[PDB]
A paper describes a structure:
In [name], the [name] ([name]), [name] ([name]), and RicT (YaaT) proteins accelerate the phosphorylation of the transcription factor Spo0A, contributing to genetic competence, sporulation, and biofilm formation, and are also essential for the correct maturation of several protein-encoding and riboswitch RNAs. These proteins form a stable complex (RicAFT) that carries two [4Fe-4S]+2 clusters. We show here that the complex is a 1:1:1 heterotrimer, and we present the X-ray crystal structures of a RicAF heterotetramer and of a [name] dimer.
Despite the fact that [name] and [name] have only about 20% sequence identity, their monomeric structures as well as the structures of [name] and RicAF are nearly identical. In fact, superposition of [name] dimer and of RicAF revealed a root mean square deviation (RMSD) value for 166 aligned Cα of 0.982 Å. The most poorly aligned portions of these structures occurred in the α3-α4 flaps, suggesting that there may be some flexibility in the turns connecting α3 to α4 and α4 to α5. We note that the gap separating the [name] and [name] flaps is relatively large (∼50 Å), and we speculate that RicT may occupy this space in the RicAFT complex. Despite the structural similarity of [name] and RicAF, the SEC results suggest the RicAF forms a higher-order oligomer. Consistent with the RicAF SEC results, we identified a RicAF crystallographic tetramer. Thus, we tentatively conclude that RicAF is a tetramer in vitro, consisting of two molecules each of [name] and of [name], while [name] is a homodimer. Because there is no evidence for a [name] tetramer, it would appear that the association of [name] with itself precludes tetramerization and, indeed, the tetramerization interface between RicAF dimers involves only [name]-[name] contacts (rather than [name]-[name] or [name]-[name] contacts). Examination of an equivalent construct in which 23 residues from the C-terminal tail of RicAGst were deleted similarly demonstrated a loss of association between [name]ΔCF and RicT. The C termini of [name] and of [name] emerge from the RicAF structure on opposite faces of the dimer, and Fig. 7 suggests that RicT may require contact with both tails for stable association with the heterodimer. After attempted reconstitution by incubation with FeCl3 and LiS, little if any Fe above the background was detected (0.23 Fe atoms/heterodimer), indicating that this complex could not accept Fe-S clusters in the absence of RicT.
Author numbering:
A (entry chain A), C (entry chain A): 6 to 120
B (entry chain B), D (entry chain B): 3 to 119
Write the structure that this text describes.
């Protein structure tokens, strides 16, 4: 009576896991991890992010408030236009959609299942 | 490999399998008792008319008049929220929502962990 | 040695308070408070906001998730286009700017005051 | 009534009156001692050159090489942050910032409360 729900939710998930969207997500992440300059940009973004946040909580009186804010905007724009990053971020969403269409589908045949 | 149609079907069955639960079954039962209740049916029609009267008071630019009716509507909804039959419904709805949430989560979390080999 | 700072910060504030930007902010708020339909829209926005937030924390499975979200967007758009609201929200910012130009000015002749 | 020029002048004097404080005075004093310090001057030039070398390793697409220098820069900054003379500076800077914040706040708060008669 209880397992019958887990077992089917596990099937549905293992299905999504061996779906076209998943096999893609995988390969895009592999392409990104193996890419080195995307790595260069990512490591940088990591550093600038921290700096930004520190300055941000220090307030607008900070000497590099304007600068670190540009540095932040700019590094984002390097990720935004990096193919391997872009490719993965798209692949991530395609999967996120699969997840939500499923979430919606579960909710639909419960709302209508009352009538 | 599976297409989105396979996965949407697999989900539509789990959705029925979720309609086949204590929780959902309780929900319909409280849902039955609130429109059956003729105190709830009284207010939902008292306010239904009061709402339609407000449409007229929108056209007829009357500050004091439209807010007399407005203050009477909002208070009548809060008063309707104190009925124990709807109080039961509001809870059962939340309980159903939690199972749906839990189901949805257990799914995304398996996927998000297992995805990277 | 201590009061000399408060007294001047109080002068600067009492100046801003009897500035053109302030006398305007005042009259715009009076115009808005005295306006009744702007009031109708505002009272409504107050109600929808609460409803929105409740539904928002209930999650996307809620029956009126889509509806209350539209109702939210739409009432905002009624404030956005209400003249008396718009007028006041502009007047609010003009003052907020006065405040910031001052904040900046205090910070400038401290940074350069080192040299 | 006053124009924005009157108010910007009134502020520019308070700014000097703020430069005429214990806090700001302490700040310049710690500021003096860090570039006077030839351990700080060592690292700020060691890293200054290391930074310029990284520009070359950007052109010359070399993953391992650019991150060898990168890992050496970031660690050398953290090591520079452990110098007590700069540690003093970082604090005095914060103390100055707080007075500037407090001043700015006391001003907006008087205005935002008093504005509506």
């Amino acid at each position: 009576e209880s397992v019958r729900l887990q077992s089917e939710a596990q099937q549905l998930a293992e299905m999504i896991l061996q779906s076209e969207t998943a096999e893609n997500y995988r390969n895009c992440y592999k392409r990104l991890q193996e890419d080195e300059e995307a790595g260069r940009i990512i490591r940088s973004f990591i550093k600038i992010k921290e700096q930004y946040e520190d300055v941000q909580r220090f307030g607008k009186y900070h000497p590099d408030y304007r600068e670190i804010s540009r540095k932040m905007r700019e590094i984002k724009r390097e990720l935004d236009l990096n193919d391997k990053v872009a490719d993965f971020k798209r692949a991530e969403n395609e999967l996120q959609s699969i997840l939500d269409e499923v979430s919606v589908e579960i909710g639909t045949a419960v709302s209508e299942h009352v009538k | 490999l599976y297409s989105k149609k396979d996965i949407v079907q697999q989900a539509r069955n789990l959705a029925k399998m979720i309609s086949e639960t204590e929780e959902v079954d309780f929900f319909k039962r409280a849902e039955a008792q609130i429109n059956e209740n003729d105190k709830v049916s009284t207010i939902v029609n008292q306010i239904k008319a009061l709402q339609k009267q407000a449409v007229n008071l929108k056209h007829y630019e009357k500050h004091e008049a439209l807010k007399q009716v407005e203050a009477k509507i909002d208070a009548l909804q809060e008063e309707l929220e104190e009925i124990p039959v709807i109080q039961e419904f509001r809870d059962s709805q939340m309980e159903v929502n939690d199972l749906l949430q839990l189901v949805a989560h257990t799914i995304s979390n398996q996927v998000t962990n297992e995805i990277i080999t």
